[PDB]
């Protein structure tokens, strides 16, 4: 996250950190995700596409730091890794960039609720907040587009949803943004999501609930003028989610 503040998982208790193991001993961060129900975490397909071997990923819930432990955290294995059928990327956009990970602890259990582990709510069918709404994004992604390391402390920031008309302006993203995407930016192009925040949540309040409105997916640069962050429009994928989380 560019700008923003440093926070603790109690402020985003549904945030999931996904890492990949390497033969050799290291573990590297891959993407963020969100807990939808006790056994399911949703993220973005592009985070797994190049290495879809589930046995090599680890998921942690209740984590405020990247490589050090947080007391209360839970470690999980990926029982099922579901990528979207129709996922495609072009020169910028990723279409149908959503993925599901069914998690299982080494003891055979799913997530358990605590002050650091909570689920986030799903929107109702094609129901979104109106443009203008301020939503928050959280993650361990880059703090500057030139950095080559991720922060150790979790960050959060607030961005506003913008209309498709504004985002599809030729000088923003044009037709690359579709109806299954949402754009969000900072009025002053000061704070934004960046590489590493990928797969994580865009949370807004809908009908009184903190709802997972988007998944961090793509953007040109990070915090660049007239280059909003583009998120997967979760409300348009509910049938697909249902199809696997029944």
């Amino acid at each position: 996250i560019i700008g923003g503040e440093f926070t603790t998982i109690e402020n985003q208790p549904w945030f999931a950190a996904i890492y990949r193991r390497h033969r050799g001993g290291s573990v590297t961060y891959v993407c963020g995700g969100s807990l939808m129900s006790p056994c399911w975490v949703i993220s973005a397909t592009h985070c797994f596409i190049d290495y879809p071997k589930k046995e090599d990923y680890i998921v942690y819930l209740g984590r405020s730091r990247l490589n050090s432990n947080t007391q209360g955290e839970m470690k999980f294995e990926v029982e099922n890794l579901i990528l979207h059928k129709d996922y495609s990327a072009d020169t910028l956009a990723h279409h149908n960039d959503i993925a599901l990970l069914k998690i299982r602890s080494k003891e055979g259990r799913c997530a358990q609720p605590s002050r650091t582990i909570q689920t986030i709510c799903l929107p109702s069918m094609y129901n979104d907040p109106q443009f203008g709404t301020s939503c928050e994004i959280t993650g361990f992604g880059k703090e500057a587009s030139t950095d080559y390391l991720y922060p150790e402390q979790l960050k959060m920031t607030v961005v506003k949803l913008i209309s498709h008309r504004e985002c599809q302006q030729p000088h923003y993203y044009g037709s690359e943004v579709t109806t299954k995407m949402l754009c969000a930016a900072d009025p002053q192009w000061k704070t934004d999501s960046c590489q590493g925040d990928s797969g994580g949540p865009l949370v807004c309040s809908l009908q009184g609930r903190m709802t997972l409105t988007g998944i961090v997916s793509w953007g040109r640069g990070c915090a660049l003028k007239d280059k909003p962050g583009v998120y997967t429009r979760v409300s348009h994928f509910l049938p697909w989610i249902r199809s696997h989380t029944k």
């Binding site: 109690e10 402020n11 129900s37 986030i120 903190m210």
Partner: peptide, 10 residues
């Protein structure tokens, strides 16, 4: 206790 989606507790 049990999950209540969208609720933070601080």
């Amino acid at each position: 206790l049990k999950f209540q989606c969208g609720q933070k507790t601080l």
